[model samples]
Target chain A: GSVTAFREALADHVSGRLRSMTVEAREISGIDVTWSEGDQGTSDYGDEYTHLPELTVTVSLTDGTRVHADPGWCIENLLRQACGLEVNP
Target chain B: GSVTAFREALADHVSGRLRSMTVEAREISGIDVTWSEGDQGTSDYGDEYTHLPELTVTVSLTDGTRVHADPGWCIENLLRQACGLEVNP
Candidate 1:
C-alpha cells in the first residue's frame, strides 16, 4: 500500500510541476512505478548482469533544458515529506 | 572547501567500512570525487548528449552479494552529518 501511495503521489507531483512533461507508468511486481526516461538498459554485475532496476526520470523543458533524478529518491523524499518516513535513519 | 571536505569524509567512510573494496578517487573542477565503478558511460540528452556525472558506488561483498549507492547522495548525507548542510531544503 505504501508503494502504491508513493507511486500516486510521485506521478501527481511530477506531472503537476512540469506541465509539458510526458510520463510513462507501469506496474512492476505490484508496485506502480513511473519514469520519464524509458529503459536505461543493463549494467555488468561481475558474474552475471541483469536489467537495471533503478528508475531514471528525465525532464525536458520546452526551452531545451533537461535534468535527471532517480525515481527511488523521489519516492523516498515524497514519503519523507508526506508520511514522515526517515530515509536516512 | 565544503566539497573537498565532503569528498574526504566520503572516501574515509567508504574505505573504512569495506576492507576488501577498492576505490578510485579523482578531482573534477577541484571537487574531490570517488567511484567504486570505473566509468558508467554517457546518456542521451535529446539534442546534445553528455557524460553521466552521477557517481555510482557498487559494493561486491566477499560472499557474492552486491549493492549500489549514488555517491552524490552519500556525499550529501556525509555533509549533513558533518557540517549540517540542509540537502533537501
Candidate 2:
C-alpha cells in the first residue's frame, strides 16, 4: 500500500520487462525498464538506422526507500509491487 | 607533398589548438585538432545553456594513413603539417 498507487500510475507509461532496480534512498527506488518495440533513428555513417525501447524511472516509497530504475526494467516491478503480480522471479 | 593540399584545405576550416595526432597507416594519419570558438545551446534542465567550440577531422595521408581528430584539436596540426609552421610544442 506504500506506493501502490504511484507504481500503478507509472506502470501505464512503462512498457516491457524489468532489467534492474536499486534503492537510492531510505524511501526512494530506481529501476530500468525495457520494451521490445520502440523508435528508430538513422545511423551516423549513412542511411542505416537503430532502435531502442528502454527507459529509467525513480520511485519514492512510504518508508523512505528510493528506487532508481534503468531503461528496460520498469514494468515488471510495477506489476509486482502494485498489482500483487509475480512479474519476475 | 603527399596531403599538403588536403591539409591546407582543412586548415582553413579548423580554428584552435592541436591536441593529438597519430599515423593510422603507413601512408595515412589521424589527428585531433580543435577550435577555441563554437556554438551554444540550452541544457536539459530548465532555462540553462552550455557552449562548445570544438570539432574533429579525419585526414588521409598520401601514404594511406587515416587521422581521426576530436573536437577542439584540429587547427594546429593542419598549420604545422601544411604550412611547415610549428603550431604546437
Candidate 3:
C-alpha cells in the first residue's frame, strides 16, 4: 500500500516534464536539486548505513514543458553514470 | 543510483491477477513486465546482444497455472506493488 501524500506527488512528478527536483518525506524535507544530476552515479566505498525505504523524489515543476521523465529512468541513468557507462539514456 | 542487487531484485517475478504466476522477476521484483508488453514490444532478436540492457527471466511456480503474460506490466506491477497507481486522481 502507498502513503497518502506521496501518491499525489508521485503522480505529479511522473505526469509533468521536470525542470528541477527536491526531496521530501516524513523525517526529511527540503532537498534542493536540479536536472543536471540526472546522470550521476555512486560507488560502495565499503560504508554502512541504515536502510531507507521508498526514496520519494519530488520533481519541482509541473506542466508539459517540464521534460517528462520517470523516477526509474532517473535512477537508472544515475546508476549507469556511477558505473562509468559513459553514455547516459 | 540503484544497485545490482536492487536491479536484480527489481528483475524478480512479476505480479499477475491470473490463477498463478511462478516467475519472481516476471512479477514481484519491481520491474515493468508482460501485462503491458502485449501492447508494447519487448522483442530483441537482433544479432548484437551487446549494449542492450534487457532482462533474462525464469519462472517456477508452486502451482502450475500458466497464464502467458507480458513483461512491462510484470515489472511495473512489481516495482509499483508497494507504490500504488490507481487510474485517476
Candidate 4:
C-alpha cells in the first residue's frame, strides 16, 4: 500500500474521490500531485488577487494521461470536474 | 487588444512568454486566470506545508484547451513545461 518517495496522501485523496464516485482503481501506475499549496502575489497585474487556499489534486496516469483539479474552486467542487464526474458529484 | 472582463494581463504574460519562445498566438479566444492570489490555511494534512507566494499563471485557451504554470515552481521555470518549450527556453 506504498511506494518510496511517493505522495501517498495525495494519491489517497484522488482514490478516495474516485471511490466516492463508484469508480474502481484496478491498479494505478502512479499519481503525481503538486506540493499541496495556494500561491499568490503581485508579479503581475490582478495578481494582487485575493482568495482562500484550496487543493489542486492532479492525477497523472501512465503514458501521458492526466486529470487535474483546479485550485480556483474548493476541492469538493473542483475535483468533480477533473475526476470526470458530473459537476458537484 | 481588448475584451470585456478578460484577463488581459495574464494573457499578456502567456503571450509574452510564448512570444519569448518564438511562438505566436495569433488569436486566442480568451484567457481566464484566477483572481490572482495566494492561499494558505489548515485545511488538510499537508495543507500546513510552508512556502512563499508565487504565481500560478494558467492560460486557458479557446474550446477546451489550457496550459497552466504550477505555483510550486517559479513562473520562469514552470511555464516552460506548460508552454511546450524545451526546459528553460
Output the number of the TM-score-best candidate. 3
> Residue B86's C-alpha lDDT in candidate 3?
19
Worst 10 residues of 4 chain A by lDDT: A1-10
Docking class of 3: incorrect
Q: Candidate 4 at residue B69, lDDT? A: 44
Candidate 4 local lDDT, B1-89, one digit each (tens) = 21221233344445544413322344355444444444446765656533444445465555445566444333322222221223322
Off by over 4 Å in 1: A1-54, A63-89, B18-89
CAPRI tier for the interface of model 2: incorrect
lDDT (10s digit) by residue, model 2, range B1-89: 52554444444333221223432233434454443453446656866433433333565566554445332223223322322323333
lDDT of 3 at B34: 23
Model 3, B1-89: lDDT tens per residue?
12333334333423433453324433332222221111224448744211212333333344443332333333333333223331111
Tell me the tens digit of each residue's lDDT in model 4 across A51-82.
43544445444434455534332233334433
Error of 3 at A44 (Å): 48
On a 0 to 1 DockQ scale, where is model 1?
Answer: 0.03
Sort all candidates by DockQ, best to worst.
Answer: 4, 3, 1, 2
Ranking by lDDT: 1, 4, 2, 3
Better of 1 and 3 by DockQ: 3
Which of candidates 2 and 3 reaches a greater lDDT? 2
For lDDT, the strongest prediction is 1
Q: Please tell me which model should have the higher TM-score, number 1 or number 2.
A: 1
Fraction of reference contacts reproduced per prediction? 0.00, 0.00, 0.07, 0.09
Q: Candidate 2: lDDT of A11?
A: 41
